[PDB]
Design a protein around this nucleic acid. Sequence first.
RNA 1: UCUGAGAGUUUGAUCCUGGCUCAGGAUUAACGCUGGCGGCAUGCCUAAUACAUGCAAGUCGAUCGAAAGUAGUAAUACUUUAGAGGCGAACGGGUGAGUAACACGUAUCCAAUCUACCUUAUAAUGGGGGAUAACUAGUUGAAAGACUAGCUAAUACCGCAUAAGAACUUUGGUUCGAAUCAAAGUUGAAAGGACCUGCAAGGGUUCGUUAUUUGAUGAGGGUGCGCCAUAUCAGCUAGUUGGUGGGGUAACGGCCUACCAAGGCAAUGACGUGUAGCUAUGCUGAGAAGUAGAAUAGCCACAAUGGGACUGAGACACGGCCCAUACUCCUACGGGAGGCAGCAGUAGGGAAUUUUUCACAAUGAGCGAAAGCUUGAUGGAGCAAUGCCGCGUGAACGAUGAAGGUCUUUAAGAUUGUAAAGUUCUUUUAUUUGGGAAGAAUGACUUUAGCAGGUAAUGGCUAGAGUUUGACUGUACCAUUUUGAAUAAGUGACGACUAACUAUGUGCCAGCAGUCGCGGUAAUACAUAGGUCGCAAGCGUUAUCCGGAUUUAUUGGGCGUAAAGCAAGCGCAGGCGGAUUGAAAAGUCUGGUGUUAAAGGCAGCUGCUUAACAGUUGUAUGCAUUGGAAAC
Lengths: 67, 77, 203, 276, 80
Amino acid sequence: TNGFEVLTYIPGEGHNLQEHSVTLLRGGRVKDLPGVRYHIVRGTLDTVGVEKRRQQRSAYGAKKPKA
Amino acid sequence: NIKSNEKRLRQNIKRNLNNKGQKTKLKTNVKNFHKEINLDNLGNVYSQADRLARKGIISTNRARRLKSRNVAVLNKT
Amino acid sequence: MKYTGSIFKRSRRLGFSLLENNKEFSKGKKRKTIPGQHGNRFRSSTMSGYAQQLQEKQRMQYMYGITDKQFRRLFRLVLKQRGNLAVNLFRVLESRLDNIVYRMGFAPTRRSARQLVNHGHVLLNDRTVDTPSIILNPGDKVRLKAKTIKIPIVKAASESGVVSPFVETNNKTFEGTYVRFPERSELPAGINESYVVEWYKRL
Amino acid sequence: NKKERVSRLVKMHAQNRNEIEEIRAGDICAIIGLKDTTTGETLVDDKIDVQLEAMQFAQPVISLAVEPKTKADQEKMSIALSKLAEEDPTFKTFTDPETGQTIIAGMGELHLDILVDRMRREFKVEVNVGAPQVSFRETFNKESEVEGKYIKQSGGRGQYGHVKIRFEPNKDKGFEFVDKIVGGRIPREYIKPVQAGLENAMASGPLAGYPMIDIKATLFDGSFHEVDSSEMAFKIAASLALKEAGKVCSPVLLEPIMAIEVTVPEQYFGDTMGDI
Amino acid sequence: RMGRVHYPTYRIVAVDSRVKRDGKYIALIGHLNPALKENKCKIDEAVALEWLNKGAKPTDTVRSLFSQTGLWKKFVESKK
RNA sequence: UCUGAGAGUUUGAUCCUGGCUCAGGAUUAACGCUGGCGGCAUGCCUAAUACAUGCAAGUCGAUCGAAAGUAGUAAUACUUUAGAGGCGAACGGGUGAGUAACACGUAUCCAAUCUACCUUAUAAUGGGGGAUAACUAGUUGAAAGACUAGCUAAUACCGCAUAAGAACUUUGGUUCGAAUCAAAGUUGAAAGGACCUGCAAGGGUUCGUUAUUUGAUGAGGGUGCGCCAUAUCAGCUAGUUGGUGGGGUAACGGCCUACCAAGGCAAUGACGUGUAGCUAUGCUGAGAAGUAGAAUAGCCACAAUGGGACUGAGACACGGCCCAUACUCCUACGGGAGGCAGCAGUAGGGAAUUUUUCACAAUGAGCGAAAGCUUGAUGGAGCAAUGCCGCGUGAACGAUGAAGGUCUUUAAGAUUGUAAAGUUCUUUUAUUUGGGAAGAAUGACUUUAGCAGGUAAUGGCUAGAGUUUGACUGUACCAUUUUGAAUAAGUGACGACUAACUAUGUGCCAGCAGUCGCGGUAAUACAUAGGUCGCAAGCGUUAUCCGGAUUUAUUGGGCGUAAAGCAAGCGCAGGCGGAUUGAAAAGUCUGGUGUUAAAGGCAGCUGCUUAACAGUUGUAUGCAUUGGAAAC
């Protein structure tokens, strides 16, 4: 939203990438990536889901799996 | 809109006219004393000062201060 | 939470059967090993202050049936008074309503006592209690309504109830009275509370 | 099934909004509040039956996809459609699964004009007209045969599977499988997985993701190993062979040819024949 | 009054009509719970007469609460 | 005493200086996955951005004339007030834009000022005059309104008289810039209402009003002290500094002005710039202190901005006026309404801050002898798991452990697993039956009993009886009321740090992740299944603050080899400073007094069944004064 521009990591397998979407941000730290200590939230208005996932349903914004 | 606001406005327009009238009656006699520094003019000024103080147009402290200033000049005479 | 699932699971894992040898009884297997898919000879080397403190705290809050937040809340309540906080804290814990009911044998388990209290069948000094969180003082009386004494289950539990010298029971009238603070030998010696006291580093 | 609180009543006059309190049998007004009411709802105060109507209209349905340009404007446009649907319950908007974009319907050009004006004035979201989309189901034409191999060593142990699948398309009969393995070239335990191995993969098309329909699949020959060669090898080989068959077969598309009843007075009949 | 909802606790105070509700008060008379049907106000009845004689009349709701104690019976005669 | 926890991370290996991350509490939190309730608090820090509509100060006929209408022959009874006049409006309500200094916190001095109504009692409420709305008519007018001439009353206005008492001046006297008092010169106050009694006359009860006079109270002014960063900001300042005279706001004061001048502040850091509501208080640790100054309580100020004046006792005035400024809206185009940081609510922003809610039931406020009117102050209800407490989502019995799954995967078996299959019991909740609150005991209204100057009268004070007093709510809650295990669990993680592991896939590809660091071939580090562990109607997640971190160190580090002695000398201010004798008591220690608001914390206790929450008692600290001590 500010004039600055930020590098972030896209978590998980798969992508919801179109290079045109406004999306929210997440904290955290990933020291392997040079210059990337910011993250994109997975499971919001954009980057909505990771499939096959049945664990770690705090990130990835995946609905609880039931039969 | 407040009905009491406009009511008090139309009231204090007339009140302001009357207060300006009394203030000018005071000041013209104050000028008269400045011209004729005598006992009669001071008596008139203090009568008018009491009249304003009776209703409350001039605070008693202000009236006391101005009458002290005038009585000092009269005593110097 | 308040329910731990299978009671035998906790007893087998933590080596503490609430009934002397009934919750780790030969019920298809008689073993002290922890349950799960990894039943096997293992070298126990992580058993230290961290591990033992967690074990004592978990056993405490599972035998007492109290959630962690309530448990620290009662600890803070104990902190307000002065003296030997360990023994006094344990006495305050033993003065819990469902624990007293279980020690009287009026309810087979603390969970059964919780069910009895919450459904509203326990009377305390002209006041019926609905929340299973009550601390009793010496000379405090507990009554069971005529409506709630018609059940073969509760009568069978009463006839096979737990004996406790520190309180007075009238089974012919279904009356209980908290006589005095239970003595150290009258308290369960399975758990050592000092480690749990040292677990409090929120000061 | 809820009690709404009538806050205030008002009649929209020629130029003024006269706020009134009492309404008798014969007068009409509007209510402020009740911000979730849908047209056609009836209001009840003294326990009367509701006069809810559902069989008084006809469908002018003509699907027209509206392509989005900015995703934020699309998200606001979704709320705009939600806030405009109750305006006309007979106004239709579809949400295509393959292309998750709005599909407007209306009664002609002026209908689209008034709807787009409603979107672009109150919500200030302006969108350019695109082009409609169709389901466009898929089949294909007969092919000779397909092979499938899968050999791996990953995990400290390999996985092995060899299958021969011959992929037969149809036009009326859907997915069906016939087994012909004789001679121990595959154990029976992996017969049923392959039955599920093909059909689950059949729903993917090599053109635009339209599922492949009305196909027959069969197994003739295969190969495996000793205690290795677990179940998943043949299951994935079936899907790989299915995809290869669907790709190399030069598939064919199908669209529903709608039967049109053109009803006209006895004035444009010859002109209708000429136009068709 | 103050306190949690469904628990009216109005501390008895001497009020000059210019002050806002439960703001900076001149002097608290005591405490009284209207729900309990029993006299519980902590009053000295000496400083109360001091405030009565220095003006700034407190709430009227407690005047009756002072008629039961006989404050008027002595106040009206101490006026003379 | 309040009261103290560490681990890992450099190396072939060892130690040391230091850093980093984790281990825990809290939010004016939110996101993501789910989601039962009760109790209770909280719910725009961003745009003090613009904002439709209703409320957010109205009241007084026992103030007045008059106006209209329901009865009545009229008279008059009955209902209301358009206006004048009176009180109220400056307080409540809301924000923190702006404000870096007596604004804030605190004690004095006001011999520097006032305070309507409340509290104190006393002189009095004497006699006249003039208009004026209201009303009518004419004009400008579409109305909105404005202009012109007559008509009308007052607790409205204006002379005069009395003025003990008051102000002013003079003579005398008290006292250390003022005090009390004797005489004299001068000056000025109003209005009756309502009711009762009385043939009248007149008298009485209350109110309204003037004067005088006690507190209390609010505001204002001066004061020492402490109360952000910033020197990679050395000069700042011209009514400034000071004096004489005069005027002026409540006052003293260049506050302002006429004249004379030249200083004042200032390296103990002014001035400059950024930021900023402050305090009590919220959290953190034992503390030094840091953190945040949600709500709250007080103080501070503006109300779209810049100014100005008036009424008023107090305003430069949340929704007063005028002017200038940006906009909306209406206009018949002539000109007009103006300003939701009031309750709401919306456009937008953001992670987000809510019903376009009820009643003033209760308190309060504003007003009126009164029936009492208003009250989006105030107290309830609604939404939201934002947060805290409690509470269910069953319990008893029931196996070498049913089935199936998972695993060694043998033709042992373990595992899930008293979980279950299944039998009894049981109802907080889901569910009908009955019952049903405390909260007015606020007061008033009507009757009586006693009280008093007066009693010729009712009113003034205290009691007793009946009248009513709820927005809440048939709510809470209760009673074998009926049926009923039935009506309600997900969450993160298991290589270690730091309790909790095995199987399949996987080939530096995927991906994990707070760190060490994992994955290019049997991966307990990844993805999944199962198992397991920990929390829970919440779990994680980030932001951010205290602890660990004593890791800016009086408490609580060093400067030879891990960072660090100016290259040396001279040296001011300032800091530190030998003893003996005497004094003083400024620092210092102690005794006493008053203040340091409530709320909050600490300890004790009380109640809503009980925690949460509320309430009660005690409770520090600092300030000034009084009195001691002379060991520094």
